[PDB]
């Protein structure tokens, strides 16, 4: 039996402290190849351990293909190989695309669908999973207008999260760390922020907001843990809802939904399944 494993790396589509992502080719088809820095080996191990536990398969979860460890002279090479989404991240896409009502709802309901799939325990099945680093750079846009959730390097089954998206209980270190539901409620906070980022790009009455990240007006770039704690915990600020949203029934409903993801009390926040149901009744 022939096992053709060689992947041709073609173009770098992302570089950071995590390492690099490449468009590659295997047997005539695009794949995405994440090459980990030694600094972030634990993210490869965690995502590989999760996929060795449960082979997640969902239209709104980035599709797993392979985990590879290769011995080198003086180092270990760690690759994660997935489906390739040529439209890139939601963060990328929102910069220079605006949305209509149908495309905005389709994006957010697809994210909610992927998140509820992670969060749910299925018996007889899958363990419940919290993501712990949900953000617009960790969501990819597919050609059919739905999105998928990426990067399970911090996920927990039943590195810290991106500080801009951290829930108040994470910033004030009150999170109930032994309690799995706490981690779902941290994802819901982050989902609300992503919902806000997308909703801003939905046109109503000839108006749209420019792309901005959550809290762009109250924290610096690369905000510190203290910068975030002061805004979110001490002053209890939340992202602005522009007046123009209140002329549009879809954005009026989405504003209500995002507020129900942002309660200071984590147990007051909506569940991913309740968010899905609410989105299916909008429009
Ligand atoms: C090891 O490494 C890599 C391997 C491959 C790869 C290439 N051809 C064929 C395969 C294959 C799949 C599945 C079976 C099954 C068939 C039914 N039988 C009852 C059990 C066995 C056999 C062979 C694979 C897995 C790709 C890779 O990357 C693109 C690899 O590198 C990560
Ligand atoms: C890793 O990824 C890819 C792998 C392959 C691939 C290559 N050789 C063989 C296979 C295979 C054959 C047969 C079985 C059996 C298992 C049990 N039996 C009861 C029925 C089915 C399983 C596996 C596959 C899946 C193709 C891919 O794409 C076309 C892959 O994706 C990029
Ligand atoms: C968030 O995280 C992961 C993401 C991915 C991933 C999957 N498909 C496509 C991409 C991508 C492709 C292309 C662009 C650009 C470049 C071409 N053009 C100039 C504009 C568009 C951006 C992004 C990525 C980055 C894979 C991962 O692992 C293998 C990730 O980590 C888990």
Swiss-Prot record:
One of its GO terms (molecular function) is activin binding. Expressed in normal parenchymal cells, endothelial cells, fibroblasts and tumor-derived epithelial cells. Changing residue 1 to I: In FOP; with some atypical features. It is found in: Membrane. GO terms for biological process: activin receptor signaling pathway; acute inflammatory response; atrial septum primum morphogenesis; atrioventricular valve morphogenesis; BMP signaling pathway; branching involved in blood vessel morphogenesis; cardiac muscle cell fate commitment; cell differentiation. Residues 1-283 are cytoplasmic. Changing residue 159 to P: In FOP; variant phenotype. Changing residue 125 to W: In FOP; variant phenotype. Keywords: ATP-binding, Disease variant, Glycoprotein, Kinase, Magnesium, Manganese, Membrane, Metal-binding, Nucleotide-binding, Phosphoprotein, Receptor, Serine/threonine-protein kinase, Signal, Transferase, Transmembrane, Transmembrane helix. ATP binds at residues 13-21, 34. It catalyses: L-threonyl-[receptor-protein] + ATP = O-phospho-L-threonyl-[receptor-protein] + ADP + H(+); L-seryl-[receptor-protein] + ATP = O-phospho-L-seryl-[receptor-protein] + ADP + H(+). The active site is at residue 133. GO terms for cellular component: activin receptor complex; apical part of cell; BMP receptor complex; plasma membrane. It is a single-pass type I membrane protein. Its cofactor is Mg(2+); Mn(2+). Bone morphogenetic protein (BMP) type I receptor that is involved in a wide variety of biological processes, including bone, heart, cartilage, nervous, and reproductive system development and regulation. As a type I receptor, forms heterotetrameric receptor complexes with the type II receptors AMHR2, ACVR2A or ACVR2B. Upon binding of ligands such as BMP7 or GDF2/BMP9 to the heteromeric complexes, type II receptors transphosphorylate ACVR1 intracellular domain. In turn, ACVR1 kinase domain is activated and subsequently phosphorylates SMAD1/5/8 proteins that transduce the signal. It is linked to Fibrodysplasia ossificans progressiva: A rare autosomal dominant connective tissue disorder resulting in skeletal malformations and progressive extraskeletal ossification. Heterotopic ossification begins in childhood and can be induced by trauma or may occur without warning. Bone formation is episodic and progressive, leading to a debilitating ankylosis of all major joints of the axial and appendicular skeleton, rendering movement impossible. Belongs to the protein kinase superfamily. TKL Ser/Thr protein kinase family. TGFB receptor subfamily. This is Activin receptor type-1. It comes from Homo sapiens. The chain holds residues 202 to 499 of 509 of the full protein.
């Amino acid at each position: 039996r022939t096992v053709a494993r060689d992947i041709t790396l073609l173009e770098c589509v992302g570089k950071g402290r995590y390492g690099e992502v490449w468009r590659g080719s295997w047997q005539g088809e695009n794949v995405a190849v994440k090459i980990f820095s030694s600094r972030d080996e634990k993210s490869w191990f965690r995502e590989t351990e999760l996929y060795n536990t449960v082979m997640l398969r969902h239209e709104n979860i980035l599709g797993f293909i392979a985990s590879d460890m290769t011995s080198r002279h003086s180092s270990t090479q760690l690759w994660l190989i997935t489906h390739y989404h040529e439209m890139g991240s939601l963060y990328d896409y929102l910069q220079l695309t605006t949305l209509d009502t149908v495309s905005c709802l389709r994006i957010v309901l697809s994210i909610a669908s992927g998140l509820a799939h992670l969060h749910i325990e299925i018996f007889g099945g899958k363990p419940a999973i919290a993501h712990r680093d949900l953000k617009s750079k960790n969501i990819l846009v597919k050609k059919n207008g739905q999105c998928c959730i990426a990067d399970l390097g911090l996920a927990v089954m039943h590195r810290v999260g991106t500080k801009r998206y951290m829930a108040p209980e994470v910033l004030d270190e009150t999170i109930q760390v032994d309690c799995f539901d706490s981690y779902k409620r941290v994802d819901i906070w982050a989902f609300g922020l992503v919902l806000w980022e997308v909703a801003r790009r939905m046109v109503s009455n000839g108006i749209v907001e420019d792309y901005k990240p959550p809290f762009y007006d109250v924290v610096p770039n690369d905000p510190s843990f203290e910068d975030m704690r002061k805004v979110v915990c001490v002053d209890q600020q939340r992202p602005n809802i522009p007046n123009r949203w209140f002329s549009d029934p879809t954005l009026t409903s989405l504003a209500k939904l995002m507020k129900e993801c942002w309660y200071q009390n984590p147990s007051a926040r909506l569940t991913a399944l309740r968010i899905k149901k609410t989105l299916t009744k909008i429009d």
